Design a protein around this nucleic acid. Sequence first.
DNA 1: TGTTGACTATAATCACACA
DNA 2: TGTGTGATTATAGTCAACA
Lengths: 75, 75
Amino acid sequence: ESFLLSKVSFVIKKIRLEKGMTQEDLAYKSNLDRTYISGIERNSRNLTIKSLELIMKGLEVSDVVFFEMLIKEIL
Amino acid sequence: SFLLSKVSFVIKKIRLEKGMTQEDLAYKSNLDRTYISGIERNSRNLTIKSLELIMKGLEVSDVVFFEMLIKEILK
DNA sequence: TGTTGACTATAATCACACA
DNA sequence: TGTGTGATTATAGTCAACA
């Protein structure tokens, strides 16, 4: 009652910090909301595919890399 | 209207690789057929939680799903 | 209940990728 | 060689009104 979503909501936080960004920066660059971005990283939002596609663009990272990094992270 | 269409392609593919109807995936993943139908028509927004249920009823891990998804991304 | 109608998947087939 | 994805007709299937 947690997995995958927890793993997806972790890589986002990993990359964002490795990119030296902020939740206010991510919410702005992905046209989303800081309250929404916050809740995700702490696993309090359901998160959709389209709402994830916006994140990778806000984080400035291709879809391929995100999933490749996602695959590793679960291991 | 891209990533949701690329994930959906893999959904029916493994469904057609494992050899099962949408009604079978609807049952095995505990989801309404109209919803399973929906995401394949392209689409319904599709939450991550629902996506996790799909893989469970698809008898495949997430790593083999994303790997297959990525292979379907590179052209 | 019974059935019409439009929107679907489904299944059989072909043909050209690819390895 | 060999399997497999794409595209195709064509059948069967779904659902959502109606009286």
